[PDB]
Amino acid sequence: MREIVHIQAGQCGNQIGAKFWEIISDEHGIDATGAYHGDSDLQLERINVYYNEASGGKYVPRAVLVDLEPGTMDSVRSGPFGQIFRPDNFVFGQSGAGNNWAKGHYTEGAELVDSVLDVVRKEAESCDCLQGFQLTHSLGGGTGSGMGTLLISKIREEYPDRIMNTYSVVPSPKVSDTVVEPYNATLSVHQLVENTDETYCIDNEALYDICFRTLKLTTPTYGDLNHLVSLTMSGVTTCLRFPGQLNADLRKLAVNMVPFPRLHFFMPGFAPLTSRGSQQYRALTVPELTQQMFDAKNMMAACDPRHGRYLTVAAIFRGRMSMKEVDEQMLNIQNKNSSYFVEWIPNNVKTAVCDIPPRGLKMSATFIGNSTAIQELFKRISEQFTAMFRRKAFLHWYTGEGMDEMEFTEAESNMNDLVSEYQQYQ
Amino acid sequence: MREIVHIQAGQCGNQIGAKFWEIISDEHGIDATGAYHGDSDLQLERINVYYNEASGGKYVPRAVLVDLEPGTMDSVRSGPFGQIFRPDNFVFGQSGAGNNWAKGHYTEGAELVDSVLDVVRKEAESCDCLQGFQLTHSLGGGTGSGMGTLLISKIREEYPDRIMNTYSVVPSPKVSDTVVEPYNATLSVHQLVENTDETYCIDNEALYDICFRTLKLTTPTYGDLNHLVSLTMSGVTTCLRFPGQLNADLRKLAVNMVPFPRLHFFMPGFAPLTSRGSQQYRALTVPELTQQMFDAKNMMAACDPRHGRYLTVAAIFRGRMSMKEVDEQMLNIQNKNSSYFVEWIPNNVKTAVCDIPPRGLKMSATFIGNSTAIQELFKRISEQFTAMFRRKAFLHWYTGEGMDEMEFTEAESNMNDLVSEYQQYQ
Amino acid sequence: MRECISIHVGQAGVQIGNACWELYCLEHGIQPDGQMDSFNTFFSETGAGKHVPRAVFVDLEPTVVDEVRTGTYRQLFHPEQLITGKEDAANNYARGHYTIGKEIVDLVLDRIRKLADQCTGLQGFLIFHSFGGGTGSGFTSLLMERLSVDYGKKSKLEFAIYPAPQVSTAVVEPYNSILTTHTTLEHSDCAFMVDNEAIYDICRRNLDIERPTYTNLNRLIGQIVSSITASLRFDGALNVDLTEFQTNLVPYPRIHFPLVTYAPVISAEKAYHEQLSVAEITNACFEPANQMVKCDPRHGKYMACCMLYRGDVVPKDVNAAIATIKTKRTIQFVDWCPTGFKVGINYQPPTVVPGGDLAKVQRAVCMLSNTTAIAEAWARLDHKFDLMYAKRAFVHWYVGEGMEEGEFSEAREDLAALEKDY
Amino acid sequence: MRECISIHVGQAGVQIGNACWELYCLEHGIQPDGQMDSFNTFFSETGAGKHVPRAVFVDLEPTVVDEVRTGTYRQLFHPEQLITGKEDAANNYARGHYTIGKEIVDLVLDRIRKLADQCTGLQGFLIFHSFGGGTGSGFTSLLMERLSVDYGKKSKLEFAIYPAPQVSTAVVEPYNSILTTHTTLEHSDCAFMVDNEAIYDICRRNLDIERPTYTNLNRLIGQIVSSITASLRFDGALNVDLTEFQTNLVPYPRIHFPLVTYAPVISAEKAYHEQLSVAEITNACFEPANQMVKCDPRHGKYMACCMLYRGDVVPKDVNAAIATIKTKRTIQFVDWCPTGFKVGINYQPPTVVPGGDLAKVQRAVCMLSNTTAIAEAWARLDHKFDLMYAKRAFVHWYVGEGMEEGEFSEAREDLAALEKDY
Ligand SMILES: Nc1nc2c(ncn2[C@@H]2O[C@H](COP(=O)(O)OP(=O)(O)OP(=O)(O)O)[C@@H](O)[C@H]2O)c(=O)[nH]1
Ligand SMILES: Nc1nc2c(ncn2[C@@H]2O[C@H](COP(=O)(O)OP(=O)(O)OP(=O)(O)O)[C@@H](O)[C@H]2O)c(=O)[nH]1
Ligand SMILES: Nc1nc2c(ncn2[C@@H]2O[C@H](COP(=O)(O)OP(=O)(O)OP(O)(O)=S)[C@@H](O)[C@H]2O)c(=O)[nH]1
Ligand SMILES: Nc1nc2c(ncn2[C@@H]2O[C@H](COP(=O)(O)OP(=O)(O)OP(O)(O)=S)[C@@H](O)[C@H]2O)c(=O)[nH]1
């Protein structure tokens, strides 16, 4: 029931999806091979949403692995929990777009679109009812963005009624890892305003600073980023996967977060996040989390909501507490953060609770909010695009793949209209 | 009752028939010598269809082995289950047509026609009621095609009412194993449009690609091809051999598949086909098979039905499920594949189920369908024939056996009329 | 004292006859061999504690007959009433009507004639077969006209397995169906429904049997025939004869194709969950989905309605329930047929089987009418016939049995005239 | 003899129906399977020692239905009265009203119609749902008009979970609330209050349960419905029917939204600390904070007051307490409604659950009126709707279900006219 098919693009996307899958194996009591060992019926009652009916009392993730190179392929398969995936879900290229959107979308994507559509259709038909999709990729990378755009386009033209979310990784503003990454973000967003119902923006430097300061780690790594990503993962999907006094699903969140079809970018959230010698001393209560719900420190996608205005807030909780405390806390949050909040969207806090807490924590809290802070990020991206497109630098790589000038012109015009609409809302 | 006599031509045909016979020995509980050891009465109740009453509580296959050379003869007899055949059924030549249709049909076939007719008449008379025949040969080979043509002609002039099917092996379009194989296919088809009630076209490269990709084998061999062939074997003949809630026979299929006497070429099918680490993870349910019924991947005779239109579909099932699920699945197959299906043949799915599943699998499914995709294969064969007959190359070998020009002209005219009629249906 | 003769042709007919005889044997306490006066309507007194069915089992293929003669009821059935064929028509009406049927119709005609000889109170004939089966179409039809010409105005009842609109064992089913319908139309006194898909759907949703088998279908037929024949095999307040059945529902010889429905079909665990009262069971049975026919009766008009209550059913409650059925507008009738209601009350409760889907209940009702929705199925079959015969497919098979296409065409127009007669 | 039908839509509706049936089963001694004549108002006699609820469980999502069909009361409920959906509206009134509701309204309409067929003494309909839930708004509304058009003037009672002013699961709750209120206004015979925050506050301060759960809310609804239906399920000095409830509180069809309150809500340890006398319990219940509604009734005027005493309550003491209630000036009434008091006395003491928050007591009173303070909540909801629709947010979601903004606007003005009608 309400089956969800996972598709992962790029090395970062593949690592994120894998880490998710081990986290789901923890949450649902699944070992490294696939056998179930959970101590409660709640883990295994709704295992079919992310697993399929496997013979011998086994379960395999409903995942699709896509890449243009088998290097991360082999590392993921040979890594932990690599035997839980059938070899068929691993489909890879042999060239690699080299961080180029046009190459991965047209040149090498031409011979991978058939495979990805075949596997996603097999996953959809082999299941009872596909509630929606979830994709992970990086907009900074060129190939991963191209696979994301191609898959969202094909899903929209194939399943226009089935909603989804895309967990794209926007490149960090502070670091220019790829010279042609502004093109990648440009084209990915131009396709996202058009083929995606809602999108969460995940920015690198914000999670980097969180791991550095909030978690108090001197050696941040991709592992902690994937861990927090998997926490966001579980926080969003626990309402559908696990029983709750206030049951919710991705459709509820999409209805509660999208006021306009083009206004669908939101910035996810997780809490509490404390270290060993603070957790045993911190208050394990709701106020310690509500002071952590709204802050630029434990903040996800690097643009401060204080400068802008929140559109609406969604809060999911997992633990043992009553509901009225949450309601009064949300009312106090409005009362004190009225200036930071929007005046014409009263009671803009979406409140739901999943009964089952995650493994190892008796609360986790996932802050799903939307603010006009992403306007700054989009405007900076647009001005950067104008800056190095005025010089017409690095255009040859794209024009060699069948590109054109005014195409990029309407792309930048689309982001201009999007940022203008967001400013008008502000 | 309803006895069927097997005749095998060519090395490939002999290997295929042998492998069939070991598979039937598995299905009916027959050991390598001929003794019965099946655990159920269902195996041995209808053993007389493919076996004869042998003294000492034994059973021997109702097979006829024909070749122009004893090399494969000795290998087959000295191979597994070689003692289950009496030495009399092994009749061989000593010259070999050398992949020539005219030689194997006139020069060396003159001294083998008497033997093959004598043995087939002995098999027919020694039995109660011969329901029909089944022949295996390769159209790419020259001798095997000539034996196939001669035997179908003699059967038609001797038993015009007893239907049969021919499991001919059409040469692969991608590889030209024999230079004069277009002549072989030409003459074999010219005799098949005329002496055969229905024919299944088995193409090499399609099964090669299936073994390579669907089965995920890096070293495909003739053994796997013969195994899948024996699965097709069992799938077609299980309805007659084994009890079923919807009993069927070859006559039912022939009536359900032949709309015109010249329109009798069909393309067989088998499913499911999954490896060890996919079977324990795949869904062992009907939808996993119905997504596998209609696909260019698990596809038998290398011509895509999507380009053409299906004439009608026959589906036989063996397992433990209810029938209404099959009916609604067929209705959904029509609903979604209406464009790929024919509009003027409503409910063109032939539905029947054999109760007894094959040994080792609790479902097998044999997809018997007909489409205008074979039009492409026939047209390519015709144009190749025109290409190297315009140059009059390699005609000397055939003209030395008593050949003539306009004979080949009406042969190519017959394939032209056949392809024109198939296009008219399309 | 009186008797009736049951005829079974084809695989479906043989299985149906076997199931019906299983009912008649377990209802009257017959052990598989034939031992321990209303039971004489179907069994004959000879010797000591003996009974045998008054039936003929014939099929062009000996598989089903062999299966019957291997059950524990070999002693129950006379061996000589089982007829084994050699060449099955294979879903070909012409094959079983001319090639094999013509040379084996003689013994069966001949010895069912003796079955009538020792049964001087022959009420009528029961025929069980399938349109889809070539044998069950051709041989059944030809023996039907042979019955008509050898008995005149003797009542004859037909139970045919009509292939469903989306359920067809053979693609050549329209040919057999149209041919047999045109051939036996003038002589078919009364022919019913069987929709296999509707049976499966009802079993899956009412009996909640996710994995049913043709045994459920076999007593689906068995309970229908038992409810029909309870009046002849058991006394009641107002017993109904076979003649009155065709008298009520055949004012015109053209329309004699009524549909049948049973109430209720409830498992033992669900029988704990519901006890029957007249109003609820009748209104549930009149519901289109409860009908075992895949045609919504509300599309057209209703011809007549016949109730067959069995058990402890009060006639006054019957009248009140039937009236409140009449008043509601979901039920409509033809203008010239205002009073077409006949009620047959029997005091024999319906009989159960050990290990069966149905639950053992003291009362039941049989739903008996001829709705106009059958015209929808007839029109759809005619349209499919037109489509699949327009390019003249599978005709050569019937040609090889020695006729040209003309008879196919005028059978099509005959059935079209039947369809437009509504 | 007589019956009533309860309707449960959405997660809240299904949970409420399950809790109410738990009450009705434990009050009458029903074991989870259905065994051991006033209990026939909600259960049906079939077979032997059998009862099943007269209810339909339907939701666009099958989670709550699956939870119900996994409890120990699987045998208690018929399987066929549980309806499982596939696409939850997800707090969208239009989604559950058009996209999924329109193709599943048929079976429910259809078979609640049989529930009325076997219940000839159908007193009325009970509806339990939530405004916040998209299913519980849209599907509930559409089935409400379907009830109105298929039954005419039949009494229908609605139990709606109105989202609280500061408690809202979904931010799109104003859209669903306004749409359903405008849609079912003309047909809603009587709709009540549920304030989740007020329930939590009362449980935390009266029952002193610092950590309550939705089970407390479930019997909060359960005890309310039990006190309402005690007159129909048990005799008393002056029993009250469903018709009189809407007769007293609906002199004008526009205003039919009375609030409900129970007395008392006291734990066993606190029940040791207080025994009930009529004056104290009534004056405590009339206190605004004791009301489970987050609207102070003293802001406006009082329409009418209805008392539902159950147990050993003296009518003379009732009259004296009600009079001394009248004299005090904290209670005020409209000029044209001087005598709007109806008292219903029942001899059945309120029933307790093992392990429940409420204490087992021989007497109770139900507080039943329609204060003007509901206008404050309606005005606040309308103001929030105006604010959050002024920039036209979340409208495209309803647009994708295929309507333009107009109907939103005129629903807003319709509810504004309702608000200013006070
Ligand atoms: N309802 C029902 N129908 C059955 C059953 N068994 C067989 N049938 C019918 O029989 C049809 C299959 O063809 P048959 O009637 O068996 O044909 P046959 O017995 O082989 O006779 P020929 O076609 O002449 O060879 C199906 O379409 C069914 O409608 C059964 O158990 N129940
Ligand atoms: N008082 C009370 N209200 C409940 C309870 N459970 C759910 N609710 C109500 O249900 C609302 C949550 O949305 P639901 O009604 O469950 O929506 P749904 O069932 O998912 O249906 P859709 O929104 O159409 O998908 C909350 O605002 C509550 O008011 C309960 O146990 N007690
Ligand atoms: N959080 C997180 N970020 C990662 C991880 N791996 C890579 N990234 C980020 O992703 C960005 C590169 O995206 P990537 O997916 O590698 O591009 P690509 O186009 O797929 O690269 P290629 O396959 O063409 S070579 C870098 O900025 C890097 O910081 C990871 O494991 N976790
Ligand atoms: N699937 C399958 N194909 C085979 C097998 N053996 C041979 N073939 C195919 O058959 C073709 C040759 O046909 P073959 O029967 O050997 O010709 P022939 O005329 O009999 O050869 P000869 O006896 O005159 S020497 C080749 O293309 C080969 O691929 C086999 O065991 N399995």
| Domains of chain B as residue ranges with CATH | 3-257 (3.40.50.1440), 265-374 (3.30.1330.20), 375-426 (1.10.287.600)
Q: Can you give the C-alpha Rg of chain C in angstroms?
A: 21
Q: Does A332 touch chain D (CB under 8 A)?
A: no
CA A57 from centre of chain: 31
Q: What count of other Cβ atoms lies within 10 Å of the Cβ of residue D30? A: 21
Q: What atom in ligand 4 is closest to the CA of residue B143?
A: 19
Between the two ends of chain C, the Cα-to-Cα distance in Å is 40
* A174, amino acid identity: K
Q: What atom in ligand 1 is closest to the CA of residue C214?
A: 31
Question: Burial of B87 by CB count in 10 Å (0-12 exposed, 13-18 middle, 19+ buried)?
Answer: exposed
Residue A125 has its nearest CB partner, among B216, B282, B291, at B291
CA dist B367 and B290 (Å) reads 10
Question: Burial of A299 by CB count in 10 Å (0-12 exposed, 13-18 middle, 19+ buried)?
Answer: buried
Residues pairing with B365 in the sheet: B271, B317
At B208, list the tokens. Answer: 């090669």
User: Which residue CA neighbors atom 16 of ligand 3 most closely?
Assistant: A11
CB-based contact A11:A120 (threshold 8 Å):
no
Ligand closest to A176 (CA) is 3
Q: Is A204 annotated as a binding residue?
A: yes
Phi-psi region of C288 (alpha: psi -120 to 50; beta: other; left: phi over 0): alpha
Interface test with B, best of C61, C137, C166 (most B CBs within 10 A): C166
DSSP letter, residue A136: E
Q: In the sheet that D341-346 helps form, which strands lie side by side, from edge to edge?
A: D259-263, D363-371, D302-311, D341-346
Pairing of strands B265-266, A349-354: unpaired
CA dist D54 and D115 (Å) reads 7
Mapping DSSP to helix (H, G, I), strand (E, B) and coil, where does residue A153 land? helix
As a whole number of angstroms, the longest Cα–Cα distance in chain D is 62
Mapping DSSP to helix (H, G, I), strand (E, B) and coil, where does residue D78 land? coil
DSSP letter, residue A214: I
Q: Which residues of B touch A86 (CB under 8 A)?
A: 277-278, 281-282
Q: How far is the CA of B177 from the centre of ligand 4 (A)?
A: 9
At A1, list the tokens. Answer: 């029931």
Q: What count of other Cβ atoms lies within 10 Å of the Cβ of residue D150? A: 14
* D126, amino acid identity: L
Q: Does B252 touch chain C (CB under 8 A)?
A: yes
Q: Does A304 touch chain B (CB under 8 A)?
A: no
* B51, amino acid identity: Y
CB-side neighbour CA atoms (13 Å) of B175: 10
To the query of whether residue D376 is one of the catalytic residues in this protein, the response is: no
CA dist C405 and C24 (Å) reads 44
Mutate to test the pocket of ligand 3, among A7, A8, A12, A92 (most ligand atoms within 8 A of CB): A12
CB-based contact D60:D103 (threshold 8 Å):
no
User: Which residue CA neighbors atom 32 of ligand 3 most closely?
Assistant: A222
User: Which residue CA neighbors atom 12 of ligand 2 most closely?
Assistant: D133
Q: Chain B window 176-195: which residues touch A at a Cβ cutoff of 8 Å?
A: none
Enumerate residues 6+ apart whose C-beta is below 8 A from C312.
C347, C349, C362, C363
CB-based contact A263:D396 (threshold 8 Å):
no
The size of the A-B interface in CB pairs under 8 A is: 35
Q: Which residues of B touch C171 (CB under 8 A)?
A: 256, 312, 345, 347-348, 350
| Active-site residue identified among C197, C244, C287, C401 | C244
Q: Does B217 touch chain C (CB under 8 A)?
A: no
* A339, amino acid identity: S
Q: Does A114 touch chain B (CB under 8 A)?
A: no
Question: Burial of B59 by CB count in 10 Å (0-12 exposed, 13-18 middle, 19+ buried)?
Answer: buried
User: Which residue CA neighbors atom 7 of ligand 1 most closely?
Assistant: C12
Residue B287 and residue A60: Cβ atoms within 8 Å? no
HEC sequence for chain B: CCEEEEEEEHHHHHHHHHHHHHHHHHHCCECCCCEECCCCHHHHHCHHHCEEEECCCEEEECEEEEECCCHHHHHHHHCCCHHHCCHHHEEECCCCCCCCHHHHHHHCCHHHHHHHHHHHHHHHHHCCCEEEEEEEEECCCHHHHHHHHHHHHHHHHHCCCCCEEEEEEECCCCCCCCCCHHHHHHHHHHHHHHHCCEEECEEHHHHHHHHHHHCCCCCCCHHHHHHHHHHHHHHHHHHHHCCCCCCCCHHHHHHHHCCECCECEEECCCECCCCHHHHCCCCCCHHHHHHHHCCCCCCCCCCCCCCCCEEEEEEEEECCCCHHHHHHHHHHHHHHCCCCCCCCCCCCEEEEEECCCCCCCCCEEEEEEEECCHHHHHHHHHHHHHHHHHCCCCHHHHHCCCCCHHHHHHHHHHHHHHHHHHHHHC
Q: What count of other Cβ atoms lies within 10 Å of the Cβ of residue B388? A: 15
Q: Is B69 annotated as a binding residue?
A: yes
At B192, list the tokens. Answer: 């098949």
DSSP letter, residue C191: B
Residue C391 has its nearest CB partner, among B323, B330, B344, at B344
CA D322 from centre of chain: 25
Question: Burial of C329 by CB count in 10 Å (0-12 exposed, 13-18 middle, 19+ buried)?
Answer: exposed
CA dist C362 and C367 (Å) reads 17
Question: Burial of B412 by CB count in 10 Å (0-12 exposed, 13-18 middle, 19+ buried)?
Answer: middle
CA dist D370 and A88 (Å) reads 65
Q: Chain D window 210-229: which residues touch A at a Cβ cutoff of 8 Å?
A: 210-214
Residue D117 has its nearest CB partner, among C208, C275, C280, at C280
CB-based contact C6:C43 (threshold 8 Å):
no
Residue C388 and residue B246: Cβ atoms within 8 Å? no
Q: Which residues of D touch C208 (CB under 8 A)?
A: 79
| Among chain D residues, CA nearest to C278 | D118
User: Which residue CA neighbors atom 17 of ligand 4 most closely?
Assistant: B141
Residues pairing with A59 in the sheet: A53
CA dist D168 and A330 (Å) reads 10
CB-based contact D308:D272 (threshold 8 Å):
no
Q: Closest by alpha carbon to D152, among D172, D125, D182, D127?
A: D125
CB-based contact D394:D175 (threshold 8 Å):
yes
Residue B277 has its nearest CB partner, among A52, A86, A126, at A86
Q: Which residues of B touch C205 (CB under 8 A)?
A: none
Q: Residue A98: CB within 6 Å of ligand 3? A: yes
Q: Residue A225: CB within 6 Å of ligand 3? A: yes
CA dist D52 and D75 (Å) reads 9
Pairing of strands D122-130, D156-161: parallel
**Residue-wise DSSP of A247-300:** ---HHHHHHHH-SBTTB-EEB---B----HHHHTTS--SHHHHHHHHS-SSS-S
Mutate to test the pocket of ligand 3, among A14, A169, A202 (most ligand atoms within 8 A of CB): A169
Q: In the sheet that A349-354 helps form, which strands lie side by side, from edge to edge?
A: A349-354, A310-318, A364-371
CB-based contact C172:C51 (threshold 8 Å):
no
Q: Is A144 annotated as a binding residue?
A: yes
Neighbours of chain B (3+ CB pairs under 8 A): A, C
Q: How far is the CA of A264 from the centre of ligand 3 (A)?
A: 24
Q: Does C274 touch chain D (CB under 8 A)?
A: yes
B339-361 in b/e burial notation, b at 16+ Cβ within 10 A?
ebbbeebbbbbbbbbbbbbbeee
CA A42 from centre of chain: 25
Q: Residue A142: CB within 6 Å of ligand 3? A: yes
CA dist B75 and C137 (Å) reads 51
At A107, list the tokens. Answer: 């040149």
Interface test with C, best of D83, D111, D113, D117 (most C CBs within 10 A): D117
Torsions phi, psi for D32 (to 5 deg): -55, -5
Question: Burial of D419 by CB count in 10 Å (0-12 exposed, 13-18 middle, 19+ buried)?
Answer: middle
CB-based contact A238:A318 (threshold 8 Å):
yes
